[PDB]
Amino acid sequence: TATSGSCKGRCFELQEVGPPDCRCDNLCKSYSSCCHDFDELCLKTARGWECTKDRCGEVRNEENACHCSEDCLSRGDCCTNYQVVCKGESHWVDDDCEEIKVPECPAGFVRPPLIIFSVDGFRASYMKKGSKVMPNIEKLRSCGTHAPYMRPVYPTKTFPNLYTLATGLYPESHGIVGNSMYDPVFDASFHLRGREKFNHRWWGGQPLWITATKQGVRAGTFFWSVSIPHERRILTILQWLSLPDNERPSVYAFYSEQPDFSGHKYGPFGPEMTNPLREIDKTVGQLMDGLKQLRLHRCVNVIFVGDHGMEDVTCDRTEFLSNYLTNVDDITLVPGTLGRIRAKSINNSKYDPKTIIAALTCKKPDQHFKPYMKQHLPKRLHYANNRRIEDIHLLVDRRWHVARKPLDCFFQGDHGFDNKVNSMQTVFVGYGPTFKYRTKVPPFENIELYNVMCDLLGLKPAPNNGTHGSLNHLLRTNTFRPTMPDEVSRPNYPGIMYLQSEFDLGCTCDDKERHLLYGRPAVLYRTSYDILYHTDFESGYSEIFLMPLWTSYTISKQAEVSSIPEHLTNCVRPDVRVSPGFSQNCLAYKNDKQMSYGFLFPPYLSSSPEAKYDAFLVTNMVPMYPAFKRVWAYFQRVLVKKYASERNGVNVISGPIFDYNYDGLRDTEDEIKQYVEGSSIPVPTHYYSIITSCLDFTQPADKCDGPLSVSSFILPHRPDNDESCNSSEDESKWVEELMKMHTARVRDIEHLTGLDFYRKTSRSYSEILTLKTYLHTYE
Numbered sequence: 181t182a183t184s185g186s187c188k189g190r191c192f193e194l195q196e197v198g199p200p201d202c203r204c205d206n207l208c209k210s211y212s213s214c215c216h217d218f219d220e221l222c223l224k225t226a227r228g229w230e231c232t233k234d235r236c237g238e239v240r241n242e243e244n245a246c247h248c249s250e251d252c253l254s255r256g257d258c259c260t261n262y263q264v265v266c267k268g269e270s271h272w273v274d275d276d277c278e279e280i281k282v283p284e285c286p287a288g289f290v291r292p293p294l295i296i297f298s299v300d301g302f303r304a305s306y307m308k309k310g311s312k313v314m315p316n317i318e319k320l321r322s323c324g325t326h327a328p329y330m331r332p333v334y335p336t337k338t339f340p341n342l343y344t345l346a347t348g349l350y351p352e353s354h355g356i357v358g359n360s361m362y363d364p365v366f367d368a369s370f371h372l373r374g375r376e377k378f379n380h381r382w383w384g385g386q387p388l389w390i391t392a393t394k395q396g397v398r399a400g401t402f403f404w405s406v407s408i409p410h411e412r413r414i415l416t417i418l419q420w421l422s423l424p425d426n427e428r429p430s431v432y433a434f435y436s437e438q439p440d441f442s443g444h445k446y447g448p449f450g451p452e453m454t455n456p457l458r459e460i461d462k463t464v465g466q467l468m469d470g471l472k473q474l475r476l477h478r479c480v481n482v483i484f485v486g487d488h489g490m491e492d493v494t495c496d497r498t499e500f501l502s503n504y505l506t507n508v509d510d511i512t513l514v515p516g517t518l519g520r521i522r523a524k525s526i527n528n529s530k531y532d533p534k535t536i537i538a539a540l541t542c543k544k545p546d547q548h549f550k551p552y553m554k555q556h557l558p559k560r561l562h563y564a565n566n567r568r569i570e571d572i573h574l575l576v577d578r579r580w581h582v583a584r585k586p587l588d589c590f591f592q593g594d595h596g597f598d599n600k601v602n603s604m605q606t607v608f609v610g611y612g613p614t615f616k617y618r619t620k621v622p623p624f625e626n627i628e629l630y631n632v633m634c635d636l637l638g639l640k641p642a643p644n645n646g647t648h649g650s651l652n653h654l655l656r657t658n659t660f661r662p663t664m665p666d667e668v669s670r671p672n673y674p675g676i677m678y679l680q681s682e683f684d685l686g687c688t689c690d691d692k693e694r695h696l697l698y699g700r701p702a703v704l705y706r707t708s709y710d711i712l713y714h715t716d717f718e719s720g721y722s723e724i725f726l727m728p729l730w731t732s733y734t735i736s737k738q739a740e741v742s743s744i745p746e747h748l749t750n751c752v753r754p755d756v757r758v759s760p761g762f763s764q765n766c767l768a769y770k771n772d773k774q775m776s777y778g779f780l781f782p783p784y785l786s787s788s789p790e791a792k793y794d795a796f797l798v799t800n801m802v803p804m805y806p807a808f809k810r811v812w813a814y815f816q817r818v819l820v821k822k823y824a825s826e827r828n829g830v831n832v833i834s835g836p837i838f839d840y841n842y843d844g845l846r847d848t849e850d851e852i853k854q855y856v857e858g859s860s861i862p863v864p865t866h867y868y869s870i871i872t873s874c875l876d877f878t879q880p881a882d883k884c885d886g887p888l889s890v891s892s893f894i895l896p897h898r899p900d901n902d903e904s905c906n907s908s909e910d911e912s913k914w915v916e917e918l919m920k921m922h923t924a925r926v927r928d929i930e931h932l933t934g935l936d937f938y939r940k941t942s943r944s945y946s947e948i949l950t951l952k953t954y955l956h957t958y959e
């Protein structure tokens with residue numbers, strides 16, 4: 181509420197309160213207000229950002245952007261090359277890499293500071309496509325810890341990903357579900373430009389800077405008004421690092437608009453990309469040079485991280501909704517590399533998403549987007565449980581845009597696509613005493629980083645979507661020790677408790693260690709279920725849901741596929757181990773015109789004709805739409821054998837998922853919205869499978885003594901195959917493409933089932949946590 185105090189040295193100061201008296205911050209330009217004689221004493225430019233010999237020993241001239249005077253080291257406002265030019269020191273990039281075993285911090289530093297150097301639109305492959313031009317970045321990468329790439333969250337846009345980095349949450353949970361959003365409860369829109377985004381109401385979860393503050397760790401200001409030149413951002417961090425140790429922050433963030441901006445103008449692989457990459461490396465070098473002359477280069481942990489990649493996208497490759505819909509003026513479209521559609525609602529509830537989606541489904545052979553109800557999007561995207569996400573979503577093909585009409589090249593790159601697309605992958609490098617030395621780590625998802633940044637600062641993370649401990653292998657020391665959750669429900673192991681004569685199911689037939697390689701899955705909620713053993717498979721059968729929670733079986737490389745004898749096609753047999761009242765019945769299915777059934781262990785993989793009869797037990801049967809059985813039957817008859825054949829055997833765990841409220845979490849019985857007609861048999865929203873083998877494929881899956889290899893999926897249990905535009909073709913032409921789109925992490929299935937897998941292995945639990953967060957992308 182005041183525009184004219186004199187920020188007594190408060191330039192870029194980390195201590196503020198409300199109004200009046202203007203604030204002294206690098207965000208003042210964004211609020212169009214600081215003690216604006218806190219301004220141009222603070223934003224100088226004179227004489228550039230590098231000392232020259234003739235400047236060495238100058239008397240401090242307050243007009244210079246940085247200083248080469250004898251009092252500058254005190255304040256940290258020397259040019260970062262000051263000691264190299266004036267004191268005979270070398271550039272940090274010219275020094276050999278020396279392992280940092282303990283933090284070497286100067287007087288007054290209680291903990292190693294963390295600096296996050298974030299770069300917008302830094303595609304992972306840039307780490308090579310311009311490698312000879314990034315000496316500082318490549319040193320950090322080769323001498324610290326790096327992954328080949330880090331996976332962003334969907335949508336692969338800046339604000340959803342920066343806030344995921346900050347909170348460890350999926351966008352649906354932290355609230356920043358796009359760069360642009362409409363919230364029906366606020367009845368307001370959020371935009372990259374403008375002031376609406378500054379209202380705290382938009383931002384959920386608990387970001388790193390608030391986590392630190394709440395726990396007594398001071399945070400620098402992570403955000404920079406775009407007018408502040410990148411060199412000044414570095415010099416300000418360095419000046420803050422020079423504050424006394426009761427004002428000095430322990431965690432800092434630098435941000436650069438590059439290489440995103442040049443990626444947009446020229447595309448990710450234009451020759452024009454080299455200059456921005458050179459400039460970014462120069463800035464990294466200024467930072468490392470600045471840390472060295474403050475004797476902090478072996479004390480600070482540095483993270484170099486991007487928010488997303490960049491793809492080739494041109495105005496020529498635009499789909500227009502007006503080519504599909506006759507009434508595009510009754511709808512609002514969030515356009516581009518993704519689509520979100522809602523009604524314009526001034527005179528319109530003829531708006532029905534069901535018709536719009538049907539009108540956007542496989543209408544042109546080479547159609548470059550696919551419509552979805554948000555709950556039918558691949559579950560790995562975790563993009564549905566937020567009122568800011570429109571019911572209608574368009575997943576846009578990489579390299580394409582979607583727009584409303586041809587009225588909506590200047591740009592050649594864009595991003596925002598499906599986060600498993602390789603062009604969207606970005607970078608992670610960690611460098612410092614707490615990160616490992618010269619260590620490469622597998623790719624990981626950016627939702628994991630908040631836990632690590634917390635660990636790096638001694639903070640307890642707020643609850644988030646990372647898996648705490650899955651990244652412990654990045655860290656030399658003070659990791660957090662994860663422990664496996666305790667099993668909640670104990671199984672029963674029923675024997676023969678009833679005889680075939682007590683069953684009134686309406687079912688007929690023509691019937692008159694090996695399979696649990698990683699230990700029994702633990703059930704982490706309260707329920708009643710039975711362990712059922714068979715020659716070919718083992719299952720945990722829920723007496724609540726009348727169907728297995730999981731079915732586990734091992735299929736050797738040499739396994740033979742057999743068909744279902746004609747006399748057995750309709751066969752369903754009572755299971756004398758399970759009460760008829762906790763059993764499904766076959767009349768429910770004959771009475772449900774829309775529902776058929778399938779089996780979790782496939783009769784096609786039975787080991788003998790004797791054992792095949794086991795596969796037809798009522799305890800192995802699950803409700804399946806006929807459309808979905810086309811998918812499931814192909815998977816069980818064809819794909820499982822294929823996977824066994826390619827991977828030297830596989831262990832498979834399959835089962836149902838119920839997520840009618842699309843929150844990514846296992847439904848309670850109350851939340852289940854669909855049952856087989858006139859029955860208590862719930863209808864799954866999805867069916868999962870987890871396919872495990874030995875990473876050393878020279879060992880059979882049942883004889884593995886090292887790291888495991890997993891691929892998993894969560895297939896939508898849908899009554900049609902409209903998602904698959906080629907489903908009228910033979911299944912060999914579309915089912916595997918469907919499954920690859922719905923690939924999943926084991927962790928995703930854990931949340932959706934309440935089960936805990938891999939509880940009995942020869943691996944460390946941290947190593948297992950890495951396995952559970954793996955995603956097989958097929959990219």
Ligand SMILES: CC(C)CCC[C@@H](C)[C@H]1CC[C@H]2[C@@H]3[C@H](O)C=C4C[C@@H](O)CC[C@]4(C)[C@H]3CC[C@]12C
Nearest residue numbers: 210377378380383384386387390403404405406
């Ligand atoms: C003008 C643009 C270049 C920069 C825009 C910066 C803006 C997105 C940032 C700056 C101030 C931030 C909020 C502030 O840190 C307080 C918190 C508390 C935390 O609990 C939730 C997030 C929130 C609201 C920050 C969100 C992002 C803000 C608005």
Ligand SMILES: O=c1cc(-c2cn(Cc3ccccc3)c3ccccc23)oc2cc(O)cc(O)c12
Nearest residue numbers: 296298342345346402403404405406433435487
């Ligand atoms: O000043 C700006 C700062 C930022 C970001 C800062 N960090 C650092 C960080 C470190 C740990 C956890 C969360 C965040 C980012 C990371 C990823 C993406 C963006 C940023 O993004 C901007 C985007 C704009 O469009 C305009 C801006 O001025 C900024």
Ligand SMILES: *[C@@H]1O[C@H](CO)[C@@H](O[C@@H]2O[C@H](CO)[C@@H](O)[C@H](O)[C@H]2NC(C)=O)[C@H](O)[C@H]1NC(C)=O
Nearest residue numbers: 349350353385562642643644645843844845931
């Ligand atoms: C992602 O993480 C958030 C935060 O832990 C989870 O949301 C929490 O969900 C529980 C269970 O519904 C609620 O009681 C809390 O209100 C939510 N937030 C917090 C801070 O506890 C969310 O379920 C996670 N998503 C997935 C898919 O696991």
Ligand SMILES: [Ca+2]
Nearest residue numbers: 839845846847
């Ligand atoms: Ca649910």
Ligand SMILES: [Zn+2]
Nearest residue numbers: 300301338487
């Ligand atoms: Zn970005």
Ligand SMILES: [Zn+2]
Nearest residue numbers: 301440444595
């Ligand atoms: Zn961008």
